[PDB]
Each structure stands twice: as structure tokens, then as C-alpha cells.
Design a protein around this ligand. Structure first.
Ligand SMILES: C[C@H]1O[C@H](O[C@H]2[C@H](O)[C@@H](O)[C@@H](O[C@H]3[C@H](O)[C@@H](O)[C@H](O)O[C@@H]3CO)O[C@@H]2CO)[C@H](O)[C@@H](O)[C@@H]1N[C@H]1C=C(CO)[C@@H](O)[C@H](O)[C@H]1O
Ligand SMILES: Nc1ncnc2c1ncn2[C@@H]1O[C@H](COP(=O)(O)OP(=O)(O)O)[C@@H](O)[C@H]1O
Length: 525
């Protein structure tokens, strides 16, 4: 068939990234482009990207009543014409290359521009197909028979800007809008007085207005404690307006799709739109070219599934040495990777450390970046457990590859996981996953590949008065869950899990065909 597709989000690897979001908006659009579709990605210009060149095409977008000049920077990479929205609110943010902290200064603290920024980002994204000729400035323009894939709350306003501004005036009529939920807790909930600044018609105010007792913290600077009233408050919600006007909802896992429809816990407070409209779970793939331990760049000894035992223990020595753990091939090696906050479950895992080293015997590597509390405790691991544990906060792409090939077991104690990528990455490289039993972790870590202890407790949640000194005995589920899995290290069962893990196929080729048909339905052909 072949059609025009336009991805719209707040991250694209390698340019911006705080986690999986960026990686999906790198991989998915390329693997769609391989099928013959004309694909584009649209992201903000947070920093002066050396490979991003000004198209010279400007436009003016109305925000907070004042017109705003924005520019459009372009780059063709892997058949995907990516575009970057240039403006002072994105580019001139707090310094040190941004990288992480795209959306806030600290972690838990957001920038008060975010309403206007992602209001600006969306409207601007709707211009790009109309007024920028690609690949070269003497080439064709994208046009109007274009499907928009929009990713999380940050691009949750393009369905409603599309209909309320553009389709009104007789363009993008053939165009449809797909929403893609990577996460449910992040909904773009803002105070109601930011309404004027959005520049949507007054009819469309009804779709943004929203009532709940849980609001994210006051958007000032220092506070990060979600206020909780008895009578529900009035506020905004970009994500609901994404659900209202999206011509289809997708999400990143069959199991997670189920958990969002399930009710106000699993849908945060938005369950009744998803359950009404429907949500197709398409689990995330991975890049096979990049993640391939038979042919990997960052590996000393490269190995297949036929030659695992040798290859891993070789790359484990490298790892043990690099972290500075005793170089013992018979000592188990558990690896944790994920952001340092409540969702990924560091706080409990770290409380569970003595039992993992002192009682089970294993070594524990710990990558992560996020809140100041858990970052502090991570660095001091190698002090308190000398040569039996390390905590790396701040790290490189290269450092995550050696960690997988070296680790015996990989650990994810998540409260919930829409899909997760570190367990997919591990299984590719033979590291046997010990996981929390939620979402994409349930779908991906089958019993043939790994272990699945029961999930970790949260509150009524989106980080309320977080982890009650009591509920933080979630720890014991990890102590227990690991004890089973590691008792069995060096079994023929373990060698079967190793082989099983790597024979699984995580390439997008399959996933894309599902994504591709969901388009055809929403359109017509
Ligand atoms: C990894 C994660 O990256 C992005 O998450 C952002 C939020 O989008 C952003 O709003 C911000 O969250 C803060 C929030 O705004 C505020 O209310 C609160 O006070 O503090 C929060 C934390 O500071 O920060 C995070 C991190 O920068 C994406 O938007 C998320 O969707 C994404 N997680 C997803 C993505 C994938 C990819 O498929 C899944 O595989 C993964 O399991 C899932 O968690
Ligand atoms: N603290 C971090 N900051 C930014 N990226 C990270 C961090 N920890 C891991 N990563 C990278 O992000 C991805 C992990 O994302 P995923 O497992 O989908 O869950 P989440 O997106 O919630 O972190 C991996 O590709 C890994 O390279």
C-alpha cells in the first residue's frame, strides 16, 4: 500500500532520552520506513545537535496570546526524515547538555513552561508536513493524507489541535490521529488557568477540563508532594483529550493494555475512555543490528546462543574487573537497571541488599539515575559491601552492553511496567530475568526464560506520600523471589534458560505488521 506517517513525541535516541520513550521513537519509525512508508519523527531541539541543520523554514505559533517564531531543523537518518522544533523554551534550558532532565530541573520537579512548551510543540508539529520539503529543500512536501502517531501526554494535544483548528478550515481532512500510550501516570495534569494559553477554541475546553482528588505537585520549583483533597479539584488533563479525539488508541503491551482498561487503579483515573473506545497492545521490539552479542561493538568476546557459557563468563571477568568486584566466575552476578524512583523499585531493592550478598552470596551491579536520595545510597554501596557490589549513577551506552553480557541474572522489582526494555535487552544477551509480575514483564518473561515473583506494593499512587514505612517491606518479596532463582545457579535448568532466552525474537518486523494494520483500519485500505 505505502502511506505517509508522522511520529510526534518528546524524545528520540540518540538525541534526547530519559528512558524507553526515545528508544521506541527511534526504532519503530525506522522499521516502518523499511516497509516503504514515508515516515517522519518530530521532536523538540533541547540542545544544539551537531547533525541537525536548519531548513530555513520558520513559522509563528500563538501561545499565551503572543505569536512565537519557531524554526525547523532536519536530518535524514535510516530513511526517516526527523525534525526538531527550535525555540528558546526548549533550547535555552538549564545547562550541562540537558540529556536527562528534559521535563524538569530535578526529578519530581517540572518546568512551569511545560504547558506552553508542549502546546507550542504540538501546533508546530502540525505545520511541518505542510510547509517543509524533504529530503532536500528542492524536493517534495509531506502534505495532508498523513497519519499522525502521537506519543504520551506531550503529544496528546495534536488530535484536538488537528480537529479544532486545521480540519475546520478544510485540510488534514483525510488525516487520522493515533494515540500511543507508553505510560498512564503521566497525563499532563495542569492548573485550569493555563487554559487561555493553549489557543484552542472555547468549544474544546470541555475535553480538557477534568476532576480528581489527586493533583501533581504545585508547579513552582521546590515542592514534589502531590496534594490530595477530599472534594475533587478542577484542573486540566491533556491525556484525556488525547483519548477523546484520537481516531484509535494503541499501547506498548497486550498485558498492559488489559491493566489500563481494568479500572481507576490501573487507568490512574482515565479507565472509562479506554474501556469505552478500546486499546490495542503491541509489545515493544528491540534493535537487532545494535543489540547482537554475536557481532556487538562494545564486547571483548562475542558469543551466540550455541557458545553462551564461555562468552558470558569471559565478559563477566571484564565486568567484575571494571566495577571492581572480586573476579570469581562461580559467584552469581545480579544486575539492576532503571530510573531511580518509585516505579522501578530501587528503594526496596536497596533495602534488600544484605540478604542478596551476605546470605545468598551474589554480587550486585546497580545502574540508575534519578532522585537525590537513591543516587546517594547507590554510590555508597561499594563502600558498605567492599568488592561485592557497585552503584554506577551516570553511565554510557557502552556500559549497558557489557553489563548485560556479564550479568548472570537481571533484576526488575517494578511497581508496574507498561513494557520495559532492560529485560528484553537481557534475554537477548542471555542474562536470566528475575522480574516483578506486571505488564510487559508478564508477557515477555515466560517461565521457559526466567522467574516472576509477585509485584511490589504502591499507594493510591502517582507518588502520593510515597512508599509507607511498612509498605517498604515489599523488599521481602525480592529476597524470597531471588532466593528461589539463584538456588539453581549452575543447573542444567539455568543453561536451558540461557539458551531459551536468546532464541526468542524481539525484532520489530513482527510488531510493525500489527502497527501497520491498525493504521489501515483507522484510515480505510
Ligand atoms: C522513561 C519514561 O520517560 C518519560 O517519562 C518522563 C515523564 O514523561 C515526565 O512527565 C516526567 O515525569 C514527572 C512528572 O511530569 C511529574 O508529574 C512528577 O512530579 O515527576 C515526574 C518524574 O520527575 O519525567 C519522566 C522521566 O523524564 C516518558 O514520558 C515515559 O512515558 C517513559 N516511560 C515508559 C516508556 C516505555 C517505552 O515503551 C515503556 O517501555 C516503559 O516501561 C514506561 O515506563
Ligand atoms: N536512568 C536512566 N536514564 C536514561 N536512560 C536510561 C536510564 N536507565 C536505563 N536507561 C535506558 O533506557 C531504557 C530503559 O527503559 P525501559 O526499560 O523501557 O523502562 P523506562 O523507560 O521506564 O526506564 C534502556 O534502553 C536503557 O539504555
Amino acid at each position: 500500500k505505502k502511506l505517509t506517517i508522522v511520529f510526534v513525541g518528546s524524545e528520540c535516541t540518540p538525541w534526547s532520552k530519559t528512558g524507553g520513550l526515545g528508544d521506541v521513537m527511534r526504532d519503530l519509525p525506522v522499521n516502518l520506513a523499511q516497509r516503504g512508508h514515508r515516515v517522519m519523527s518530530i521532536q523538540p531541539r533541547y540542545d544544539q545537535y551537531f547533525d541537525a541543520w536548519d531548513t530555513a523554514v520558520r513559522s509563528s505559533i500563538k501561545v499565551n496570546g503572543k505569536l512565537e517564531d519557531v524554526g525547523f531543523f532536519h536530518i535524514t537518518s535510516k530513511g526517516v526524515d526527523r525534525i526538531f522544533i527550535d525555540h528558546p523554551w526548549f533550547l535555552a534550558k538549564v545547562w550541562g547538555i540537558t540529556g536527562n532532565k528534559l521535563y524538569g530541573a530535578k526529578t519530581g520537579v517540572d518546568y512551569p513552561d511545560n504547558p506552553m512548551r508542549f502546546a507550542l510543540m504540538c501546533q508546530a508539529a502540525l505545520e511541518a508536513p505542510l510547509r517543509i520539503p524533504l529530503p532536500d529543500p528542492a524536493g517534495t512536501v509531506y502534505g495532508e493524507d498523513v497519519i499522525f502517531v502521537c506519543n504520551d501526554w506531550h503529544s496528546a494535544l495534536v488530535p484536538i489541535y488537528l480537529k479544532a483548528n486545521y480540519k475546520t478550515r478544510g485540510l488534514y481532512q483525510n488525516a487520522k490521529s493515533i494515540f500511543l500510550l507508553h505510560n498512564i501516570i503521566y497525563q499532563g495534569r495542569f492548573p485550569l488557568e493555563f487554559w487561555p494559553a493553549l489557543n484552542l477554541p472555547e468549544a474544546a475546553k470541555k475535553d480538557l477540563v477534568f476532576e480528581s482528588c489527586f493533583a501533581p505537585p504545585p508547579l513552582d520549583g521546590i515542592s514534589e508532594q502531590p496534594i490530595i483533597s477530599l472534594k475533587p479539584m478542577a484542573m486540566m488533563n491533556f491525556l484525556q483529550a488525547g483519548f477523546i479525539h484520537a481516531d484509535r488508541i494503541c499501547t506498548v503491551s497486550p498485558q498492559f493494555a488489559a491493566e489500563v482498561a481494568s479500572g481507576p487503579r490501573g487507568g490512574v483515573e482515565l479507565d472509562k475512555y479506554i474501556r469505552a473506545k478500546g486499546i490495542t497492545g503491541i509489545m515493544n521490539g528491540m534493535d537487532i543490528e545494535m543489540w547482537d552479542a554475536s557481532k556487538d561493538k562494545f564486547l571483548v568476546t562475542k558469543y551466540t546462543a550455541s557458545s553462551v557459557d564461555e562468552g558470558k563468563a569471559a565478559n563477566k571477568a571484564v565486568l567484575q574487573a571494571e566495577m571492581g568486584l572480586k573476579v570469581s566466575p562461580t559467584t552469581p552476578l545480579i544486575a539492576f537497571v532503571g530510573r531511580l524512583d518509585d516505579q522501578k523499585g530501587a528503594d526496596c531493592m536497596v533495602e534488600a541488599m544484605p540478604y542478596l550478598v551476605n546470605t545468598l552470596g551474589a554480587q550486585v551491579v546497580c545502574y540508575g539515575s534519578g532522585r537525590e536520595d537513591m543516587a546517594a545510597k547507590f554510590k555508597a554501596l561499594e563502600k558498605q559491601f567492599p568488592g561485592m557490589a557497585k552503584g554506577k549513577t551516570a553511565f554510557v551506552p557502552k556500559e549497558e552492553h557489557t553489563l548485560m553480557a556479564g550479568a548472570d541474572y537481571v533484576l526488575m522489582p517494578s511497581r508496574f511496567e507498561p513494557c520495559g526494555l532492560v529485560q528484553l535487552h537481557a534475554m537477548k544477551y542471555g542474562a536470566v530475568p528475575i522480574v516483578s509480575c506486571t505488564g510487559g514483564l508478564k508477557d515477555s518473561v515466560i517461565p521457559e526464560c526466567g522467574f516472576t515473583f509477585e509485584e511490589i506494593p504502591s499507594p493510591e499512587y502517582p507518588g502520593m506520600k510515597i512508599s509507607p514505612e511498612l509498605i517498604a517491606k515489599g523488599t521481602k518479596i525480592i529476597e524470597e523471589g531471588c532466593k528461589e532463582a539463584l538456588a539453581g545457579y549452575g543447573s542444567k535448568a539455568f543453561a536451558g534458560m540461557r539458551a531459551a532466552c536468546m532464541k526468542q525474537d524481539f525484532a520489530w518486523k513482527k510488531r510493525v505488521l500489527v502497527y501497520e494494520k491498525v493504521f489501515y483500519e483507522t484510515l480505510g485500505i
